[PDB]
């Protein structure tokens, strides 16, 4: 494989090394596969920015640009969920 | 005054593993519950809670040391036959 460069190895030696590390971080979470919550199978992928879809059972939900959830979405999804229990 | 013949007061205040001849601290006992006359065999430092079958009760409970026999009960140390 490659020691330090990973999925950013398609860029050769262009653009500078700080900018190729920003590409590598966001590209791993964007092209990964996630487990569905309705059917429980590992078949969720991204369609466009903010649209994630399951290839089996076809269900669509809304998330982040490059990751399925965002750090400020998790914070407020809990508050609504603690407020109902208490 | 030799070390091979210690007084029996000293043999009581010695650690269980420093005694001259191998000897521990536990023993088996008899217990009688209440009005009804049953008799069970128990251990002096039991780790289980026991209960009399007749007049269903709890006649022995465990602690950190010696097991605590109930208020209206009495024990007796078993002796073997010969």
């Amino acid at each position: 494989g490659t020691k330090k460069v990973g999925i950013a190895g398609s860029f050769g030696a262009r653009y500078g090394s700080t900018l190729r590390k920003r590409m590598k971080a966001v590209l791993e979470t964007q092209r990964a596969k996630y487990i569905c919550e309705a059917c429980g199978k590992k078949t969720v992928k991204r369609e466009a920015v903010g649209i994630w879809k399951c290839r089996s059972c076809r269900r669509v939900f809304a998330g982040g640009s490059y990751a399925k959830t965002t750090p400020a979405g998790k914070i407020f999804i809990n508050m609504v969920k603690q407020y109902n229990t208490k | 005054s030799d070390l091979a013949f210690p007084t029996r007061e000293k043999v009581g205040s010695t650690y269980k593993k420093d005694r001259l001849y191998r000897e521990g601290n536990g023993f088996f006992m008899y217990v009688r519950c209440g009005g009804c006359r049953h008799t069970t065999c128990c251990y002096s430092h039991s780790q289980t809670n026991i209960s009399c079958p007749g007049c269903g009760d709890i006649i022995l409970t465990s602690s950190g040391g010696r097991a605590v026999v109930s208020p209206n009960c009495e024990f007796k140390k078993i002796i073997r036959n010969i």
């Binding site: - | 030799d2 070390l3 091979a4 420093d18 001259l20 001849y21 191998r22």
Partner: protein, 127 residues
């Protein structure tokens, strides 16, 4: 032979304090062969050992006559021609003291090993 060296330090401690008896909480087989060679030479009064299904116990009776005892680790191998160099290193004078070896005839001191034409492994000394 870790029990032989532990025993010799506890004996040096009591012989210096003026004790009469010594109780140790361990006892092995060759620790009792070393003690039986001090009794027949006059350096202790007697001893006795107990059986408890633990490491054992032993009680030594001191005399007033011992100057020192020791053990040598490791147990070097000495031919019958090298017996006499270990004697000049360990005993203060030429008239008393005993160096003990573990030979193919038992445990003997350095005078017997010369009258039987043998060598062995060194164990200790006392004077």
């Amino acid at each position: 032979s870790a029990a032989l060296a532990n025993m010799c330090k506890a004996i040096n401690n009591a012989s210096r304090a003026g004790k009469r008896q010594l109780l140790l909480r361990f006892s092995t087989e060759e620790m009792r062969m070393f003690l039986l060679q001090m009794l027949r030479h006059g350096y202790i009064s007697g001893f006795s050992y107990i059986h408890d299904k633990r490491s054992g116990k032993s009680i030594i009776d001191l005399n007033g006559r011992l100057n020192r005892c020791g053990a040598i680790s490791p147990n070097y191998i000495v031919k019958r021609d090298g017996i006499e160099d270990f004697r000049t290193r360990l005993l203060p004078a030429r008239q008393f003291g005993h160096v003990l070896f573990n030979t193919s005839k038992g445990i003997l001191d350095h005078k017997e090993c010369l009258t039987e034409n043998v060598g062995g492994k060194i164990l200790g000394y006392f004077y």
